[PDB]
Structures are given as C-alpha cells and as structure tokens.
Amino acid sequence: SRECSYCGKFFRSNYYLNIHLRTHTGEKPYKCEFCEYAAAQKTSLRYHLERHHK
Amino acid sequence: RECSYCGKFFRSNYYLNIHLRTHTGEKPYKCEFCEYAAAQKTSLRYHLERHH
DNA sequence: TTTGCAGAATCGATTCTGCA
DNA sequence: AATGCAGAATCGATTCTGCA
Ligand SMILES: [Cl-]
Ligand SMILES: [Zn+2]
Ligand SMILES: [Zn+2]
Ligand SMILES: [Zn+2]
Ligand SMILES: [Zn+2]
Ligand SMILES: [Zn+2]
Ligand SMILES: [Zn+2]
Ligand SMILES: [Zn+2]
Ligand SMILES: [Zn+2]
C-alpha cells in the first residue's frame, strides 16, 4: 500500500512508504561503522558521518 | 558573561550558567513519567505537553 | 513502474530574549 | 543587579521530494 497505518499520510510509492514506516517502528538498517549510531534513511547516516567523524 | 565552550556572550551570569548546560549536558529538569531530562525549563514543559 | 541519489524542507526540540 | 517565568526565535537531525 501507500498509506501509513500509524500517521495516515499517503505517499507516492510503496517503496518510500516502507522507508517512511521505519520512523514509527524504530528500525534503522544503516549502521555507522565508526560508532553505534544507526539511521532509518541513508541521508541521516551521511550527515552523521560528515559532522561527528571529521 | 563569556562561555568558554563556544565563545558566545550573554546578557547575564545567571543565563550564562544555564547556557553551559547545553555543553556540559547537566539536565536538572527531570520528567516524573520517563527518564527524559532537560537543561532548560521550556524543554521539559514542551516534553510534558505532547508526550504526557 | 520501481528503485535510488542528493540535498532542501520540515518541525520537534532546544536556546534566546522580552519583560517582571 | 540578579533571578525567573513564558513564549518567540532558532537549530539541526531527520523526513520528503525533484529528478533520474
Ligand atoms: Cl541536577
Ligand atoms: Zn507514518
Ligand atoms: Zn511525497
Ligand atoms: Zn558514527
Ligand atoms: Zn568523534
Ligand atoms: Zn556556549
Ligand atoms: Zn517523559
Ligand atoms: Zn517523543
Ligand atoms: Zn536550519
């Protein structure tokens, strides 16, 4: 589907909905290799690398 | 009135003392429903409103 | 159509400031 | 002058979206 069962928002793709759901479930598949930080989306990890590891 | 962490200046020593918590991580405002803690009163007030 | 990059927009959470 | 409440202003870690 494309509707979030938590917050009711409607998305352009099933693909992004599934990413979106991570924000409610707490799943965070992108692990920082340098510390124990994890992120739901790729952009958050990239930002984390640029600012805490430099 | 000068902070030694970020070099910023503040209007009073009273607020400078509060400001330092942003760096030192001292969080005297404590939620009585969960383990949340805050440096400034407004943060605790916001926390209580939407969460509890 | 489904996946993905990349970075701007968003808005929760916090800091700063007007006034007492 | 020093303390303090309360809300305006700001920030930034994440979500969202133009584009491919
Ligand atoms: Cl304390
Ligand atoms: Zn949702
Ligand atoms: Zn969208
Ligand atoms: Zn890290
Ligand atoms: Zn480090
Ligand atoms: Zn400082
Ligand atoms: Zn709480
Ligand atoms: Zn929360
Ligand atoms: Zn910003």
Residue nearest to nucleotide C14 (CA to C1'): B43
Experimental determination approach used: X-ray
Q: Which residue is nearest to nucleotide D14 (CA to C1')?
A: A44
The gap between A53 CA and D19 C1' (Å) is: 30
Domains of chain B by range and CATH? 1-25 (3.30.160.60), 26-52 (3.30.160.60)
Angle at A7 between CA A2 and CA A10, to 5 degrees: 25
CA distance A24 to A50: 25
Expressed in angstroms and rounded, the spacing between residue B21 Cα and the centre of ligand 4 is 23
Amino acid, single-letter form, for residue B16: L
Identify any residues that bridge with B45 across adjacent strands, giving them in sequence order: none
Strand partners for A38: A31
Nucleotides of D under 7 A from a protein CB: 2-8, 13-17
**DSSP string over A1-52:** --B-TTT--B-S-HHHHHHHHHHHH----EE-SSSS-EESSHHHHHHHHHHH
Please answer whether residues B35 and B47 qualify as being in contact, where contact means their C-beta atoms are separated by less than 8 angstroms. no
